[PDB]
Design an enzyme around this catalytic site. Structure first.
Site, short mmCIF file in Angstrom:
data_model
loop_
_atom_site.label_atom_id
_atom_site.label_comp_id
_atom_site.label_asym_id
_atom_site.label_seq_id
_atom_site.Cartn_x
_atom_site.Cartn_y
_atom_site.Cartn_z
N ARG A 1 16.68 42.75 -0.26
CA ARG A 1 17.44 43.92 0.17
C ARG A 1 18.89 43.56 0.52
O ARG A 1 19.82 44.28 0.15
CB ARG A 1 16.76 44.62 1.36
CG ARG A 1 17.63 45.70 2.00
CD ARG A 1 17.95 46.80 1.00
NE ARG A 1 19.03 47.67 1.45
CZ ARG A 1 19.69 48.52 0.66
NH1 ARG A 1 19.36 48.61 -0.64
NH2 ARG A 1 20.67 49.27 1.15
N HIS B 1 11.91 54.40 9.99
CA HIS B 1 11.39 54.48 8.62
C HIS B 1 12.18 53.55 7.70
O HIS B 1 13.28 53.14 8.05
CB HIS B 1 11.48 55.93 8.15
CG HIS B 1 11.04 56.13 6.73
ND1 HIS B 1 11.91 56.03 5.66
CD2 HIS B 1 9.82 56.41 6.21
CE1 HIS B 1 11.24 56.24 4.54
NE2 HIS B 1 9.97 56.48 4.84
N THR C 1 7.94 53.01 1.28
CA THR C 1 7.83 52.09 2.38
C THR C 1 7.28 50.75 1.89
O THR C 1 7.67 49.70 2.40
CB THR C 1 6.86 52.64 3.45
OG1 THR C 1 7.29 53.93 3.87
CG2 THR C 1 6.80 51.69 4.65
N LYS D 1 6.76 66.12 2.50
CA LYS D 1 7.86 65.73 3.36
C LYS D 1 8.58 66.96 3.87
O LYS D 1 9.32 67.61 3.14
CB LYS D 1 8.83 64.81 2.63
CG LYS D 1 8.27 63.43 2.35
CD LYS D 1 9.38 62.43 2.39
CE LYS D 1 8.92 61.10 1.85
NZ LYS D 1 10.01 60.11 2.03
N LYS E 1 -11.78 64.97 -6.49
CA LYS E 1 -10.49 64.69 -5.87
C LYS E 1 -9.53 65.85 -6.09
O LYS E 1 -9.46 66.42 -7.18
CB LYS E 1 -9.88 63.40 -6.42
#
Ligand SMILES: Nc1ncnc2c1ncn2[C@@H]1O[C@H](COS(=O)(=O)NC(=O)c2csc(-c3nc4ccc(O)cc4s3)n2)[C@@H](O)[C@H]1O
Length: 533
Positions: free
Chosen positions: A210, A237, A335, A435, A519
């Site tokens: 990063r 986050h 994430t 979200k 599902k």
């Protein structure tokens, strides 16, 4: 191999040593350059210099080291965005203590389970979050110390960060002779992040990658530390955590806004001479529409970025034209991939694209039912691999292996295609995940609450597209045979059971069946939902 898209070689090289070493080495430098500011709260006009930031983070690392913490331990930082947030993070990184940031929005159950995973020895927390930390510590014996972040003196009998350091440091301690720990950066965990809920173990190596992207002149920002950025992203986050860590190692002045104020988000840009704003896609229509925007000296603002959620192509290029930008800069990530792994390369703007594969990474699109790798302009599920991909879910190998295959391919649950210039576009979502104003909403929690109701036979939860929240949690409801219930009632019922982010703001649609296979079909559910509105 023509159907595997690969990042180019990095434009800023990978650096040696742990992420703590790299951060320390860089901030020690900024700390010697007078008047370099690290963080600014835009609300209250308060700054902390790099010198101060570096000193406090060092005091914290040694104190923690003397307290007994090593690479076998974890800490939690539970706190809303604030000037002090990074101090324990940096401190722990300097010595190889894993940081586990807790969402300050969490209730006691979610918080208990987050920390049940992270197993932290010390917890850092703000005033707002202390009572929750207390109610958890009772049930979580491994927590031995609770340190308050937004206090100078002690508070309710608990040490602040400052009194905690004075009490564990030898007198006449010199910060500028502190040497951060060296360890195997591949196996030492830097951060455990929450993923809705599981613990995402991110080794130092990933942070090192990063730090390369961050300082990359094409894939991040060019390193002139005389740079001021405004960030509105939650620190807890991955979007907020790894952008900000990159801004600090770049020696930027990070200007913070916690609440979006229309009057402020423009004033702060002008007064502080913002060169680059890190935003979420919800503020864009605001910035596209508002007329107050016209009169400020923004000649210094050459860049605006967004990420974490879909940006309207049309809205994006509207906001880009108004600010005389070449386009909105973007990053896409999960994430589990530490940070963005698709990013719009500087100089390679293409409206609607979320960008290209970052250095060190590979990306591919695999067909939705055959799993075969697809070619140019073909919609399929996006898979990624590279060195920022998490070590695995903490004490959950089965969820790890279902997400990350034998070859390291992480299948993302997103639908995408790449064009001929190797630009990637995110056009749909396979997985069930909502979200709402940036906050993750797991549909399963909402569904189990709905089923609990005597008048509800079955239910399916997905996102309803909203122009100013992105997605509103909404449900397809199958009423129990010969039982009755309105939308208003179903909504208040759920509200009573849930924290504010999970409120069923998107409403309810009644159906005979919840779309399934073998599902729940999120796409079919989102379809039925919009077909109404
Ligand atoms: N740009 C985007 N466009 C459309 N969808 C996007 C998206 N980013 C995330 N998503 C969605 O969020 C999901 C992942 O959710 S998540 O777990 O909360 N993680 C994230 O959203 C996440 C983790 S790191 C990160 C970013 N880092 C950046 C650094 C620089 C920059 O300019 C932009 C960004 S975004 N985002 C994705 O699977 C996808 O569904």
């Amino acid at each position: 191999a023509k159907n595997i898209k690969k990042g180019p070689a990095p434009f800023y090289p990978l650096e040696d040593g742990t992420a703590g070493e790299q951060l320390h080495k860089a901030m020690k430098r900024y700390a010697l350059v007078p008047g370099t500011i690290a963080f600014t709260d835009a609300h209250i006009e308060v700054n902390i210099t790099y010198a101060e930031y570096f000193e406090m983070s060092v005091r914290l690392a040694e104190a923690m080291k003397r307290y007994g913490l090593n690479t076998n331990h974890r800490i939690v930082v539970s706190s809303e965005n604030s000037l002090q947030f990074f101090m324990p993070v940096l401190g722990a990184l300097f010595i190889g203590v894993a940081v586990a940031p807790a969402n300050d929005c969490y209730n006691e159950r979610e918080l208990l389970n987050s920390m049940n995973i992270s197993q932290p020895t010390v917890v850092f927390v703000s005033k707002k979050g202390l009572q929750k930390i207390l109610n958890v510590q009772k049930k979580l014996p491994i927590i031995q110390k609770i340190i308050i972040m937004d206090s100078k003196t002690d508070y309710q009998g608990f040490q602040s960060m400052y009194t905690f350091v004075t009490s564990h440091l030898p007198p006449g301690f010199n910060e500028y002779d502190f040497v951060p720990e060296s360890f195997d950066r591949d196996k030492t965990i830097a951060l455990i992040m929450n993923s809705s809920p599981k613990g995402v173990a991110l080794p130092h190596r990933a942070l090192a990658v990063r730090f390369s992207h961050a300082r990359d002149p094409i894939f991040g920002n060019q390193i002139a530390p005389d740079t001021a950025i405004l960030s509105v992203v939650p620190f807890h986050h991955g979007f907020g955590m790894f952008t900000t860590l990159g801004y600090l190692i770049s020696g930027f002045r990070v200007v913070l806004m916690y609440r979006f104020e229309e009057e402020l988000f423009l004033r702060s840009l002008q007064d502080y001479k913002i060169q680059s704003a890190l935003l979420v896609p919800t503020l864009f229509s605001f910035l596209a529409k508002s007329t107050l925007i016209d009169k400020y000296d923004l000649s210094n603002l050459h860049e605006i970025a967004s990420g974490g959620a879909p940006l309207s192509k049309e809205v994006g290029e509207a906001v880009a034209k108004r600010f005389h930008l070449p386009g909105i800069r973007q990053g896409y990530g999960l994430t589990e991939t530490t940070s963005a792994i698709l990013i719009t390369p500087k100089g390679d703007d293409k409206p609607g694209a979320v960008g290209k594969v970052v250095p060190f990474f590979e990306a591919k699109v695999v067909d939705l039912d055959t799993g075969k790798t697809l070619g140019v302009n073909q919609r399929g599920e996006l898979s990624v691999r590279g060195p920022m991909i998490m070590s695995g879910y903490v004490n959950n190998p089965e969820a790890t292996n279902a997400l990350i295959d034998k070859d390291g391919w992480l299948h993302s649950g997103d639908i995408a295609y790449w064009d001929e210039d190797e630009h990637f576009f995110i056009v749909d979502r396979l997985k069930s995940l909502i979200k709402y104003k940036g906050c993750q909403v797991a549909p399963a929690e909402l569904e189990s609450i709905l089923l609990q109701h005597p008048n509800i036979f079955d239910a399916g939860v997905a996102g309803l597209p909203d122009d100013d929240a992105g997605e509103l949690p909404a449900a397809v409801v199958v009423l129990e045979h010969g039982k009755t219930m309105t939308e208003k009632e179903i909504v208040d019922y759920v509200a009573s059971q849930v924290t504010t982010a999970k409120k069923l703001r998107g409403g309810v649609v009644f159906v005979d069946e919840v779309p399934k296979g073998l599902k729940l079909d999120a796409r079919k559910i989102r379809e039925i939902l919009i077909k109404a509105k």
